[PDB]
Amino acid sequence: MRECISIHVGQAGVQIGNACWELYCLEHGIQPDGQMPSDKTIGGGDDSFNTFFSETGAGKHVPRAVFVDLEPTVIDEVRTGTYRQLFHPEQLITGKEDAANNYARGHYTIGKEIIDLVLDRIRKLADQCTGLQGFLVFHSFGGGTGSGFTSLLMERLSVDYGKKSKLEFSIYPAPQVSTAVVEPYNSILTTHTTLEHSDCAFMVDNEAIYDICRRNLDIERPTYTNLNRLISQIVSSITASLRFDGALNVDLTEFQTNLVPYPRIHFPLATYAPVISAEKAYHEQLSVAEITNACFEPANQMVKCDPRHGKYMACCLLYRGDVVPKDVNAAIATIKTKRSIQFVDWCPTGFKVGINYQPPTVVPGGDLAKVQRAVCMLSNTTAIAEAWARLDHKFDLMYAKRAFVHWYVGEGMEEGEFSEAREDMAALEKDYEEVGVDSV
């Protein structure tokens, strides 16, 4: 019951998907061949981990997921990788020619050739669900597949599943590892198209993750494998409430209730702690009080925004590991005193807290220290609008000269679709401004 289907679109989506499902397996004691010695419910189960994993007669625990890409290289590595046995081949769907960092190709030219097959395979997973909760969609803003095809799929999913929840994990572009000059274009297009089809979207700013890897883990020049392993920990925190359950556990949908005041204001800011190396973590244990404080340090934010210059509309704390109510309550009391944290006048100021006693694990050969307790804060701040602004400015500079616009028109798009998408973004920035204003 309350199953959750993950959809990994494009390189970023897939590779992040690898990190996530590897980590999930380590958290639930699932071997790379799908076998799980803990589970005595053979062939079936009602357990908490069954929301992300189905079971077979063989005793094999299979991810409720789909990997889609318009080009086989990345998914091929999955097919031949350490966790090849974990999936069924029909779950790994590849094209031949990618979208060439072109939204139009991902949404139309190439995407249309594969959209039916994907939906057919998504449908086959939905039939395994006694009560599907919704979908999780991992994708990049900048890629042609990650942007174009994702929008197409999300639109199609709204039609085929009505209003079942659709959550995004969106990789926001960063220059340190950008692959295309037109990523601003693709970003604004996918954001506009998906906006009314997404219930809640967690933006991951690569520059932020790049920064954190460099600063807190002393990684000289972070790789995708570096960023993914950190990102996975954060995704794991957010989905922990769905995959585990205890008395102090608060379901993600409860957090979602607090975090979204209006359908369009559905972009929460994530801040995770502790991100610490094994060298620093040795002989130094971080308390509930300590990690909680880190959540309000912008250095630990997942998107590069400044909540100080913005106003808060919600604050959730997703604790995991060795955390007791007593310490949490005292910890927030401190921050209520030692910070100022302004809320908009129309929202209450309480912090919705959840706790999963299941501690954070770490992937072997990983960079992160294995800590006893960790926390992820989900906040709805007006500062997130800064992310739209930086991206909208990059967009504006190129569209002013219609730079690169011809690659899009050639595939079938119109200039109207551009200005339209950009106007929605202008409205969104305006919306994020409106909510911050005081009442009369």
Binding site: G131, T257, P261, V353
Partner: protein, 428 residues
Amino acid sequence: MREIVHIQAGQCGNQIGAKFWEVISDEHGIDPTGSYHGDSDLQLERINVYYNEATGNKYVPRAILVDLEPGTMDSVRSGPFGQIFRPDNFVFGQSGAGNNWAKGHYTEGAELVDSVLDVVRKESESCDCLQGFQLTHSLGGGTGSGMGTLLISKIREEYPDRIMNTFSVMPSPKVSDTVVEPYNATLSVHQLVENTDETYCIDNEALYDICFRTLKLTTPTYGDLNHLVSATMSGVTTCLRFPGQLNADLRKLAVNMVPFPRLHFFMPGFAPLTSRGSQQYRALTVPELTQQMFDSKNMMAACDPRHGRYLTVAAIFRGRMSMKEVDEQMLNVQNKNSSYFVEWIPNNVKTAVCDIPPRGLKMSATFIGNSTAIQELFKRISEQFTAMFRRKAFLHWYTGEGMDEMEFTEAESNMNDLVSEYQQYQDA
């Protein structure tokens, strides 16, 4: 006027409902399997009020357990007295209500309400003479709040001449961080003003403050909060459960406590205040039970009774004590604090004395006051409500389920009227 049908809806409802049955079962000498093993025969005189009888003379609670998710009810069924309840009287869905009044009252709950009323009907036919119903639920969630009020409205349709009683847990930011609870509560109040005869306002703000300040619990748990509710529920229904003279049935209670149809929101108090860890070796004196039971610290509603006036009061004393001395101390409060009692309702304080004391205590006192100070509670919720509604915040959760802004405005409007009505008689 004999049998009462109990119902408990949602997480909060089933938790306090279960604890309530735990307590009175012990008081009436009924064990988890349902057999009787008690000394006094006072325990079995009015046992038929809350329990049915079966083969082997086993006693089955007249209780219906309702929820939109199986969580709490699976826990109750594996709870202490879990196997006592009629297995068929478990009526649960799977979708959940997501702390949404709309889901509970209009969509997810409407899909389940008919099945519940089938169990209500079956129990009501077993009755030789039905008084009415008592519901236990929170107003802050979705199931108990939304579906609960729906069941009331539907039950009133099949049993309009019966009495509708409720133990309604009012929300407080001191206990829950869910932002939409003020919406749920305001919507529910509107329903309760219209369709209940008696409502015990159990305020989580009070229960927390009591646990933290008086009982000195730095990290109060739901079990701590419920120990208070359980104690209150036992006391408030004592006059119903054992042989007595005053407020011996729900209608008589309503006639004594409710001077006006809408003003039926009672302020419960209790003494001595107790925690599951507290020792309570020293029984209190009758004067002590009295001074405390009227003390704001002991009120379960988090209202200052000195800010309003008592329209009516019911006081229940339990345990072996000087019934003589009870009258003197009761008459003492009235004559000492005569200003806080309305003059246009002579002798508005009535008292009963039951000999059997509550579990673990030798002397206990329970308070039921229809104070006009209860408005402070509704005023609190009203402010939390408007803070959000003026900006139409979080309404999409509700409009998505089919509701409209107008229905909020009307609920807000009606509860503002209630506050003013409580104020009209406070200056009389």
